[PDB]
Subunit: 167 residues, 3 copies
């Protein structure tokens, strides 16, 4: 049936897809690691320079990955321990340089100091991301979510936090 | 040594395996997303028409994916927030159209209304699934588990749930 | 441009990388499953015979996978329910037989009996592992971490544990 050339072409396309899926999984992994490590300069490298600006009365218009990370740093201050835990991705490669990804998030936040001292926040969400490939590298272009649930409460003050990377 | 044809054949087999593993990971991802989103019609599409009926005095015999989802809907009512979080899969492709998968589950359930209002249930489990491929698509054929642990308790009624997709 | 031989060689290298990444993901999955199942003999099979001995005044020098599992068994006794939950791996294949992996850990520990009866411990950590390939199989060579946070507390004694695989 098919020539060797045709069989090779098909393999090259299939492998490129698998390589792209794996790169996008590591991209999102790096995003969560840097977000929760508060490694803002490194986090910035996961964001597309063309990161999508979702339009709405009262929301911010971001002009750059740097502005996005300035917002995240303000939203995730030193006093806030965060864990953003990604599960069970569904990655679809839409074209040579675009992709979509679903991620199942669990998040746990603990405020250790300041106005929200001893507040805990837990929740879950289904994210839907868009990614884009620029010069052989994948970036996050747009990231949105539907909350499963979210809750807040006061932690028992007797809970002993014995390690905190942000201290 | 090997002819180009032989090297290509080997690549085609290896790539088919990786494609099948990735499809099975996205299959199980879709299962959890739809289960926790209570998207029962969509959940049904993840189940094999030949879904295995585990025989035991007092258990139900399912005749179709639809009957399985009717049971799940009764087991996971609107008043129950659920998170079924899959980790660290071990997927083995057993033949061209069959596979086995191990998944590490964490689950968190919260009842918001009705008889179990303010009950929380947490646990963990090791699942072992069987999958089957029909017309180029993977389906869940059988799904079983060993519980690591399970616990229940009354939640502090002062916990503020601020978002709930089921409301 | 490239000969068919060159295109095949490239595919073989790319596929070997993807196969190695998937094998390393299943390796770490098996590690967590056996650690939390307290399946010490099986856990041992995930560890390199050349498992790295991190040098420090007061620490143990391990001579074998078996000694490592003896330590883990002492550190994770029957009375301790553990869940070590791996997320969002970043696996890099460094050479034909070496690799590095980042994993995002959440851990939850519950003591059911003995000196720490009713103690809970929760936390998170970023692991950085080294792996090595011996006779076609990947093994864990070195495993280290930075804690995000760790906390301990007394559980409400009214929490009903209804299943425990270690009982
Ligand atoms: Na959790
Ligand atoms: Zn998790």
């Amino acid at each position: 049936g098919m020539t060797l050339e045709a069989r090779i072409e098909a393999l090259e396309k299939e492998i490129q897809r698998l390589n792209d899926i794996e790169a996008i999984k590591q991209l999102k992994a790096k995003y969560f690691r840097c977000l929760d490590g508060k490694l803002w300069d490194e986090l910035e490298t996961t964001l597309s320079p063309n990161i999508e600006t979702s339009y709405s009365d009262g929301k911010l218009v971001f002009h750059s990955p740097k502005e996005v990370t300035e917002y995240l740093a303000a939203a995730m201050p030193k006093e806030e321990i965060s864990m953003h835990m990604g599960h069970t991705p569904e990655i679809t490669i839409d074209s040579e340089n675009t992709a979509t990804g679903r991620w199942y998030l669990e998040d746990n936040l603990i405020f250790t100091d300041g106005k929200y001292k001893n507040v805990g926040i837990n929740g879950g969400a289904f994210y839907t991301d868009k990614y884009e490939k620029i010069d052989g590298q994948w970036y996050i272009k747009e990231t949105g979510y539907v909350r499963i649930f979210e809750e807040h409460f006061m932690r028992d003050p007797k809970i002993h936090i014995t390690s905190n990377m942000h201290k």
